Amino acid sequence: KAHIELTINGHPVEALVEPRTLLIHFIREQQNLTGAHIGCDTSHCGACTVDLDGMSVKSCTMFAVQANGASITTIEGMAAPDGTLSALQEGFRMMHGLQCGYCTPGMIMRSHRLLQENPSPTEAEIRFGIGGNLCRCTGYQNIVKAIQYAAAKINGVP
Amino acid sequence: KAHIELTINGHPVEALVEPRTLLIHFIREQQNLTGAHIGCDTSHCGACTVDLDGMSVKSCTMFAVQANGASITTIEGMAAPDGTLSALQEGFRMMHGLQCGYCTPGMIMRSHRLLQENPSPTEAEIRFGIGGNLCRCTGYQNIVKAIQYAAAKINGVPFEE
Amino acid sequence: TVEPTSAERAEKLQGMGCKRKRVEDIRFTQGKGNYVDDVKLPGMLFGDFVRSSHAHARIKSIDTSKAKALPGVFAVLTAADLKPLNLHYMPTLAGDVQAVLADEKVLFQNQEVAFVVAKDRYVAADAIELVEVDYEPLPVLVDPFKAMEPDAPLLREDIKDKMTGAHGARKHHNHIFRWEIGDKEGTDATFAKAEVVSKDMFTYHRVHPSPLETCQCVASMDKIKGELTLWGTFQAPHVIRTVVSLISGLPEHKIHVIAPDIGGGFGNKVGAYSGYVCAVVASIVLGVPVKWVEDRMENLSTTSFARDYHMTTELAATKDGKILAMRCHVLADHGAFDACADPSKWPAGFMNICTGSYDMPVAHLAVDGVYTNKASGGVAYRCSFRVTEAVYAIERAIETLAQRLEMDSADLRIKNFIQPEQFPYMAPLGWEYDSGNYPLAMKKAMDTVGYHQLRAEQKAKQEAFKRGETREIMGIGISFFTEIVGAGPSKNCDILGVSMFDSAEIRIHPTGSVIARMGTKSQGQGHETTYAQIIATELGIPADDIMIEEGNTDTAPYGLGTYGSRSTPTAGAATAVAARKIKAKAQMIAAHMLEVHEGDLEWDVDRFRVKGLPEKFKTMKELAWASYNSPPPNLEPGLEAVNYYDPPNMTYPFGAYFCIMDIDVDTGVAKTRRFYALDDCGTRINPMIIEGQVHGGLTEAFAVAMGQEIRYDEQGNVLGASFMDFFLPTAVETPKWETDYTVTPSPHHPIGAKGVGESPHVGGVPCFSNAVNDAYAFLNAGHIQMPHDAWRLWKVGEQLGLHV
Amino acid sequence: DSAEIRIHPTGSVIARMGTKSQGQGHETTYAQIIATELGIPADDIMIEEGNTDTAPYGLGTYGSRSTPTAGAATAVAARKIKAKAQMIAAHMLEVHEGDLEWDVDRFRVKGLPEKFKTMKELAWASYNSPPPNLEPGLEAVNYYDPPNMTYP
Amino acid sequence: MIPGSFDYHRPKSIADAVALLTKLGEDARPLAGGHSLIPIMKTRLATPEHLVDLRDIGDLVGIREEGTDVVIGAMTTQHALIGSDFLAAKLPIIRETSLLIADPQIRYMGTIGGNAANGDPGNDMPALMQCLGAAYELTGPEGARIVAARDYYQGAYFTAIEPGELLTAIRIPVPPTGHGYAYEKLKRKIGDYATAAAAVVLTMSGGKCVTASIGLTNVANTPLWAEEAGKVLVGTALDKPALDKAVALAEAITAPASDGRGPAEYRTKMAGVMLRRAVERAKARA
Amino acid sequence: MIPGSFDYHRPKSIADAVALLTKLGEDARPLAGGHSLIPIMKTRLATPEHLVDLRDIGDLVGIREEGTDVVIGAMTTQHALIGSDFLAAKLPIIRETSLLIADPQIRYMGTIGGNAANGDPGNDMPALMQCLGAAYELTGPEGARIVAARDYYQGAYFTAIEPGELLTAIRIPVPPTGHGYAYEKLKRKIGDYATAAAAVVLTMSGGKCVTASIGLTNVANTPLWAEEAGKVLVGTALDKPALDKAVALAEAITAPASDGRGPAEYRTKMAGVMLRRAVERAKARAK
Numbered sequence A: 001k002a003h004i005e006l007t008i009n010g011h012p013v014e015a016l017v018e019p020r021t022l023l024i025h026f027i028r029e030q031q032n033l034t035g036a037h038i039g040c041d042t043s044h045c046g047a048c049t050v051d052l053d054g055m056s057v058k059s060c061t062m063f064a065v066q067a068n069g070a071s072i073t074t075i076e077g078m079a080a081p082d083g084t085l086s087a088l089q090e091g092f093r094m095m096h097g098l099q100c101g102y103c104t105p106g107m108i109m110r111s112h113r114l115l116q117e118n119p120s121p122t123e124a125e126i127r128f129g130i131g132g133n134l135c136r137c138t139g140y141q142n143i144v145k146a147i148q149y150a151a152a153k154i155n156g157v158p
Numbered sequence B: 001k002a003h004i005e006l007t008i009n010g011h012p013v014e015a016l017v018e019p020r021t022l023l024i025h026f027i028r029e030q031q032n033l034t035g036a037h038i039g040c041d042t043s044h045c046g047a048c049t050v051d052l053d054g055m056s057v058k059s060c061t062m063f064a065v066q067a068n069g070a071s072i073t074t075i076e077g078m079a080a081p082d083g084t085l086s087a088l089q090e091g092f093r094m095m096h097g098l099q100c101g102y103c104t105p106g107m108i109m110r111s112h113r114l115l116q117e118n119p120s121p122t123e124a125e126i127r128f129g130i131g132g133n134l135c136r137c138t139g140y141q142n143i144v145k146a147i148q149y150a151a152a153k154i155n156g157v158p159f160e161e
Numbered sequence C: 001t002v003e004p005t006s007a008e009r010a011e012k013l014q015g016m017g018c019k020r021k022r023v024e025d026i027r028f029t030q031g032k033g034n035y036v037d038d039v040k041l042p043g044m045l046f047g048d049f050v051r052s053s054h055a056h057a058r059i060k061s062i063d064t065s066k067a068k069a070l071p072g073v074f075a076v077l078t079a080a081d082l083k084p085l086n087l088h089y090m091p092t093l094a095g096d097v098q099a100v101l102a103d104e105k106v107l108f109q110n111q112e113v114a115f116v117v118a119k120d121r122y123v124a125a126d127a128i129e130l131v132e133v134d135y136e137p138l139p140v141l142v143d144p145f146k147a148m149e150p151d152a153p154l155l156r157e158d159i160k161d162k163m164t165g166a167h168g169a170r171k172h173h174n175h176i177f178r179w180e181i182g183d184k185e186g187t188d189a190t191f192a193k194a195e196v197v198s199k200d201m202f203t204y205h206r207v208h209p210s211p212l213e214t215c216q217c218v219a220s221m222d223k224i225k226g227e228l229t230l231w232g233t234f235q236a237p238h239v240i241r242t243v244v245s246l247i248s249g250l251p252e253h254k255i256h257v258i259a260p261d262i263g264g265g266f267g268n269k270v271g272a273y274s275g276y277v278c279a280v281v282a283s284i285v286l287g288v289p290v291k292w293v294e295d296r297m298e299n300l301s302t303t304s305f306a307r308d309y310h311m312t313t314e315l316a317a318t319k320d321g322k323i324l325a326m327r328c329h330v331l332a333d334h335g336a337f338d339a340c341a342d343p344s345k346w347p348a349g350f351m352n353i354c355t356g357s358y359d360m361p362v363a364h365l366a367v368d369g370v371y372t373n374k375a376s377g378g379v380a381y382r383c384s385f386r387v388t389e390a391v392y393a394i395e396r397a398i399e400t401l402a403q404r405l406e407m408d409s410a411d412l413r414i415k416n417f418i419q420p421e422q423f424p425y426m427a428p429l430g431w432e433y434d435s436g437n438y439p440l441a442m443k444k445a446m447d448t449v450g451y452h453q454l455r456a457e458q459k460a461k462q463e464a465f466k467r468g469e470t471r472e473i474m475g476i477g478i479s480f481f482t483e484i485v486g487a488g489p490s491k492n493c494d495i496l497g498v499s500m501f502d503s504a505e506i507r508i509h510p511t512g513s514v515i516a517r518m519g520t521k522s523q524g525q526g527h528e529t530t531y532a533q534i535i536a537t538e539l540g541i542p543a544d545d546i547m548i549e550e551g552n553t554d555t556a557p558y559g560l561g562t563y564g565s566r567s568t569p570t571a572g573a574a575t576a577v578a579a580r581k582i583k584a585k586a587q588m589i590a591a592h593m594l595e596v597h598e599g600d601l602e603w604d605v606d607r608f609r610v611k612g613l614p615e616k617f618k619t620m621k622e623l624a625w626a627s628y629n630s631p632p633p634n635l636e637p638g639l640e641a642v643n644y645y646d647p648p649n650m651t652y653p654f655g656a657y658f659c660i661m662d663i664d665v666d667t668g669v670a671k672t673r674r675f676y677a678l679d680d681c682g683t684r685i686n687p688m689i690i691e692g693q694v695h696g697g698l699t700e701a702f703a704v705a706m707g708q709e710i711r712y713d714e715q716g717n718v719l720g721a722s723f724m725d726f727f728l729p730t731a732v733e734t735p736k737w738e739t740d741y742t743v744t745p746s747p748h749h750p751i752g753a754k755g756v757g758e759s760p761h762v763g764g765v766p767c768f769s770n771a772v773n774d775a776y777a778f779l780n781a782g783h784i785q786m787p788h789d790a791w792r793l794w795k796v797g798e799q800l801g802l803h804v
Numbered sequence D: 001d002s003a004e005i006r007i008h009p010t011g012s013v014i015a016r017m018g019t020k021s022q023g024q025g026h027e028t029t030y031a032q033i034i035a036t037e038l039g040i041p042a043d044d045i046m047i048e049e050g051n052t053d054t055a056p057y058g059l060g061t062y063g064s065r066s067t068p069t070a071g072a073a074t075a076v077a078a079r080k081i082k083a084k085a086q087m088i089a090a091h092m093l094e095v096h097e098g099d100l101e102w103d104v105d106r107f108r109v110k111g112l113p114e115k116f117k118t119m120k121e122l123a124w125a126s127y128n129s130p131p132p133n134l135e136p137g138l139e140a141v142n143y144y145d146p147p148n149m150t151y152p
Numbered sequence E: 001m002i003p004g005s006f007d008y009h010r011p012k013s014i015a016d017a018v019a020l021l022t023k024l025g026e027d028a029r030p031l032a033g034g035h036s037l038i039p040i041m042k043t044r045l046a047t048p049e050h051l052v053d054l055r056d057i058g059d060l061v062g063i064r065e066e067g068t069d070v071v072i073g074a075m076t077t078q079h080a081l082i083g084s085d086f087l088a089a090k091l092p093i094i095r096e097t098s099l100l101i102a103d104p105q106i107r108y109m110g111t112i113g114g115n116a117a118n119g120d121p122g123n124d125m126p127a128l129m130q131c132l133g134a135a136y137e138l139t140g141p142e143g144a145r146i147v148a149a150r151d152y153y154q155g156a157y158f159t160a161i162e163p164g165e166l167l168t169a170i171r172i173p174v175p176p177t178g179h180g181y182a183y184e185k186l187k188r189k190i191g192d193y194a195t196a197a198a199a200v201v202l203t204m205s206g207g208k209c210v211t212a213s214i215g216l217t218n219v220a221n222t223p224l225w226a227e228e229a230g231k232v233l234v235g236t237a238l239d240k241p242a243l244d245k246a247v248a249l250a251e252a253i254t255a256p257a258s259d260g261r262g263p264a265e266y267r268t269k270m271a272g273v274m275l276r277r278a279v280e281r282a283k284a285r286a
Numbered sequence F: 001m002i003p004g005s006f007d008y009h010r011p012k013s014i015a016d017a018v019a020l021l022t023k024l025g026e027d028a029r030p031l032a033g034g035h036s037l038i039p040i041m042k043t044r045l046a047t048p049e050h051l052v053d054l055r056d057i058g059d060l061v062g063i064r065e066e067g068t069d070v071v072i073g074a075m076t077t078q079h080a081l082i083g084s085d086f087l088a089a090k091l092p093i094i095r096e097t098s099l100l101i102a103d104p105q106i107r108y109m110g111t112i113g114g115n116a117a118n119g120d121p122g123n124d125m126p127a128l129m130q131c132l133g134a135a136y137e138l139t140g141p142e143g144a145r146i147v148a149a150r151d152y153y154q155g156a157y158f159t160a161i162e163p164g165e166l167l168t169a170i171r172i173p174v175p176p177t178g179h180g181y182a183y184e185k186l187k188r189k190i191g192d193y194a195t196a197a198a199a200v201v202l203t204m205s206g207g208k209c210v211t212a213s214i215g216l217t218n219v220a221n222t223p224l225w226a227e228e229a230g231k232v233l234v235g236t237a238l239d240k241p242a243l244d245k246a247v248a249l250a251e252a253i254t255a256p257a258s259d260g261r262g263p264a265e266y267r268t269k270m271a272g273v274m275l276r277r278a279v280e281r282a283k284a285r286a287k
């Protein structure tokens, strides 16, 4: 096994891992951060998306050893230290952007990076921008609304 | 921390412990064997009793480091692998020898050694022989009956009524 | 057998009256019970207290700095953290308040001063030692007979202006309440004129319930959800929920109280303790679980004491032994805060059952409670709400009256028993006793022990003592008692405003097994076994096919908990009534299926047959499937019911206890020769379980009468509050018990059953104490105060000149 | 399908149903049905499904059946509670039940509208001052056998 | 979902990586962005004993102009290509093509070199590199060499690379200022490999095509460079007759798979329709 | 309940244990059976920084006959004392006394040396050892020495041991064959220290007492050797007038504590009653 050291949600993590352990399983199974989900076996769905060194990464298509030295944010890391929901978490609730909740962690983690890439995206930019994330419940329409709601809240903050 | 290797309920155990960790807390808190209980702070009650290298020991009065190399049996080790209960576990149920069940792991672990010390004890020998174990619920009468039942089952013949 | 007889089917049920073996025993004998300290949750921390070394002192300051800086310490709470809150005091079941963390002053030794929260209990313990408290000592009050003197210390500064407490006017700063009942003027006139007046002051000394598992909880505030889960040693989990809602402002649907397996309660675990409050606050603040588990020393010295009643007790009689009246005054020592558990309208509990088993026309009782620098409590330890004290007062008073009349005390009781035909009987302090056959039970006891012969044996032994042939004396202890259990009717029984009903919910599954829950909570009394027996008989479903649960306030129907030997009177009734609702629905289903009138059906253990046509029937199992598969058109699908039972009266079990005691007058060592206990609790659900309740209670009674005590010295130090001194008998000391019964059902209960669990303690203490007092009566010792341990009985003989 | 609703002494509610959400919002919507029927805020009601030990027996969620079956059972169970609350209100106000009318979150005496009792007060009364004719507490169950399908 | 076990290596230089590949042999594979390799490990189609991660080799990442070429390091990600405003100025077809590959997450990890060295005919870059007349720089134990992209692909997962070699950089001739360009892809949805796609670059003068080069994606077991189809556009107005000739010459060299994207005959026709649309958009841009 | 942190040591020989105790000073305590020391660590009445566990030192456990004595190693457990057929034959009073100490679990761990060295006047072995005239063998950095049990105890938790010393064995002269013996204890319950107890060994010939020795437990800040009380019995028939003189002489040296076992005056009188009862039982056994 390989010794890895990295940061997840702002905390140091040190572990021993087999090289073949997928990052999604390291996060869910060894770290007990079960917000990230598995929806597929072919890298399409995006339910396993995490933010990793400034990138949106499908954690089912990376080994934990590849994340050695990385900084990762998962859905558990989105709320403020005082418990307050992020703008995206609040927008998904206010706009009805989830039903079963199973795509939601990955959708919000992708969206967190999308709004850094482009703080004021059009609807076409949002839809293209979340193309790596599948949802079975919503038909996407309210997810677009949730992202637009969150962009408005973020852009009022300063 | 100190490195210990021992045997608990017939299985090898390897662990790291602080010297001041009481054996009761190593058993409950680290090994998750929560049958043994704490009933006092002065070594009187016996709720914490385990069988250790052929001895009845109050595990609240020993450090885990003292048990390095030892073989321990706790209440979880008493039933047969086929599910069937030990003679003492069965006698405690048949004779109504427990109510809240708090003293029962320690009572059965002490009694397991008592019946090895003396396979056919009188009533006076039983009462004296469990003098280290307090019960609040039963008034002891049915516990003596339980131990008599278990002895008769083990021996194949009854002694006192 | 494929077609079993009616008797065979009844036997298989293991229902009412059967010695059914306990379902609890499977997990408990294997170490697979789930008690509070077995709980482990992610992130869980450990909390414990800095406690007061002083009985009475102002707090000048507390320094927590060294504790807060220790690695692995997450919080250290003082009164200042709670006082913005208004959680520096908590309400009690007695209507007073109790300090959670000491604010300006401490009022008893070992009182909670600060709460440290750490990685584990080893780090918490280190950190508690690092807290420094500065005290300014104050004059200590420990003698309740001096509590209302003009210069007695001012304890409760927080209510110095409050001349009306929760129970009426207060006459002095250390007075809690005065409570009275009965005909004062008629009782006084009777005493003023009676032929014989017999008066003593009997003290029922302070003791403690000491369950083998101490008080503890795990609090978990989920700050994502806004919901609190609270695992804990609660005899009354629903009551705890409602209290925690009032205190915390969280709504009841978001407070999940869980009383899991409890390692004995014996009244210690009815109310709330500081530890519960502080664990809950710490978990709310930190957002992670917090476990609190007290040690023995803290249990004995800081949680509910029992007894501490000083009872000036009088009987008025004719020379021929007819009892004309009883007059009793109690001075009750409540410690620093009135935390005495009781129905809200009864600040001296049911002490007004103190006229006992006797027919007397008039009586009067008065009680004054006082504050002292001690732990709180009073009601605990199988008291049935002060019935222990009531019974001791009357059964001792019968003996001292008999000595003064120069009459045999058995004959005096027989001359004055309420007779079977007089029930229901209105007693002269207001309780209506439900049923009783006292002459039959007293006779059976007297025949069993050979009473008349024992008195001749005793007379001979006394003659031998006077001839110098022995230093042993023989006493014969008698206790004939009437209990009062099953609180209680909505007219006048409530716990902080919630009427004292209880409840049952029973649900039958399509395939005929059952889930049933009740509003009580076992701490070893076998409810998971015995409630299933009541259902089994009502429904003809084997008890093994029924699962019983208690203690999870999300799932169990609301009830008032287990204390006052109330479970059988209240939830036992509810269980029968709910089962009867199911049976009535099943009868309707059967009538529809069999195409007959309901009135043409008869019940045969587990099925309805057509009268005159026994080959036409439906079993309860068949009816249960039908209720899901083919519901009759006018009925809802399924097969379930609930009952919340408001009792019409208490139940009044009774007993006849006799003890033979031998005493060495030169060492004071007493040894029980024989102990016989006849209990009549009406219909018996499980004789094996009743017998074990009796053996446990008698052993407590032995302990209390012969050795147990919690004491305070003049400085306010608590003495004997550890198993170094507190007399908990081992198997060696504990007498062998003989038990017996009669059956006199409660006429008002659905199955005729009375409570029993506390009877053995209630009746046993006077039986032991009467045997000791009886042994010394021929030497004119007078009333000997408990406990009857060796130095004290030595002292009795020393003062009589026996050692010259 | 089925519903069980239990009102606590202080007026909040635990309710369970025999259905099982997979994202359709039952934990939100069943509370809305009860809220309207009893005048208890929806956030004062906890909805649970899916634990067979605790939920009343039901046939699950498929065939868009949850609203037709357990939704109906929810309303009917709430109306049993309402009916009991009316009797408690009659006892408190010393009037015939027939003399009372419902007004959003309270029963009022007809023609004497200043005389009333709110659901919250009635829930407390059911524990604190239960009418002698009645059982204490305030709860109900309904197992709802539908008379027809619904045809949206 | 679960790969077979392997050992994992992080060489610190090209030389070290080439040495390790050469020593370990066929059982070792380079690991770049992992978004083709890890998916086929997870199905156990690939069961390498060793992975040689190129992550720590800085010289494999970067975009520079050198002489008449742009040189792109093999480990340069799709996201980097899109983000390069220099590349958008000189080779705007690359951003257009990259935006048609996969999805945002996959584009943050997948590399141009991994896309070109893979041998999946589904990959988009190979035929674009053939269109552009790119050269692949390979370094192995025997030194450096260069293979034209037009000569690099022989079949599904079969390329000109040899044992122990890494593709280190792609060298791309820079088209004239003002050239036309287009990448036109037909697919079932976001993230899918093409039903058919065409890459076109061309230049015009006086309303007449001077140069033209065409690549075809996923309409054979390799990418295809449609030499004859481009040649026939030169000298023409890129009018209907010229386009019909180029379509015929492009269609003629296809040999598509029949799969979920449709049968071979449809995919051949779609190569022609994509080529037409690409030429039209390129013509407008020129 | 929770002791303070400490370092833990397992010396392999007596010499290594003594060196360690000597090096580490008062911060270090020997750990024997732990059944007095661990309870007071748990209350933090004791806060040693080092525990020197004697468990691996095989030499400290044993019962041997040597010259005219029995020599018992300090780590010998109460359970082992009770189980010894040899001790039952030659020193039957030991078994009788051990069976009145604590409970089965405690007796599996607690040692004779720990009972004797502790210094708690509640322990039963000390006065028994004074009654028997036993000698304690001590080994320290300065070598070996012997101190009579009669001279070992000065106060409550105040003994003759010096820094760095271990009590290694107890040497007991074997009493005459056919001696009488008794240990008579008055206690509140199983596992309680005595309200008062008396140890007696005596011998008889031809209806007369030839030798007698009496120890008194827990009726002063130390065990007591009731020298004069035993002496007055010699030459008598051990009847009530002889006992009356012994009782007076025993009571006069007591100075009991007043605690939950009763007032000092009671405890003094109970020393006298236990003495009478012990003597009577020992007289019956002697022959």
Ligand SMILES: Nc1ccn([C@@H]2O[C@H](COP(=O)(O)OP(=O)(O)OC[C@H]3Oc4nc5nc(N)nc(O)c5nc4C(S)=C3S)[C@@H](O)[C@H]2O)c(=O)n1
Pocket (backbone or CB within 6 Å): B099, B100, B137, C264, C265, C266, C267, C380, C381, C382, C383, C384, C523, C524, C525, C526, C527, C530, C531, C562, C563, C564, C565, C566, C567, C568, C569, C681, C682, C683, C684, C685, C686, C687, C689, C690, C693, C696, C753, C754, C755, C756, C757, C758
């Ligand atoms: N007519 C009857 C009466 C009782 N029983 C059975 O006896 C048991 C006790 O029932 P009950 O007398 O109704 O008493 P509770 O269950 O309400 O117990 C409370 C009572 O229980 C006592 N006994 C205790 N026993 C144990 N093991 N643990 C405690 O904490 C105890 N606490 C004490 C104290 S204090 C109290 S208040 C129940 O299984 C009941 O079915 C029966 O078989 N027939």
Ligand code: FES
Pocket (backbone or CB within 6 Å): A037, A038, A039, A040, A041, A042, A043, A044, A045, A046, A047, A048, A049, A058, A059, A060, A061
């Ligand atoms: S689990 Fe579907 S892309 Fe990762």
Ligand code: FES
Pocket (backbone or CB within 6 Å): A097, A098, A099, A100, A101, A102, A103, A104, A134, A135, A136, A137, A138, D023
């Ligand atoms: S909310 Fe159900 S998959 Fe998106």
Ligand code: FES
Pocket (backbone or CB within 6 Å): B037, B038, B039, B040, B041, B042, B043, B044, B045, B046, B047, B048, B049, B058, B059, B060, B061
């Ligand atoms: S917990 Fe009481 S003796 Fe161990």
Ligand code: FES
Pocket (backbone or CB within 6 Å): B097, B098, B099, B100, B101, B102, B103, B104, B134, B135, B136, B137, B138, C212, C263, C264, C524
């Ligand atoms: S069964 Fe409750 S303490 Fe023994």
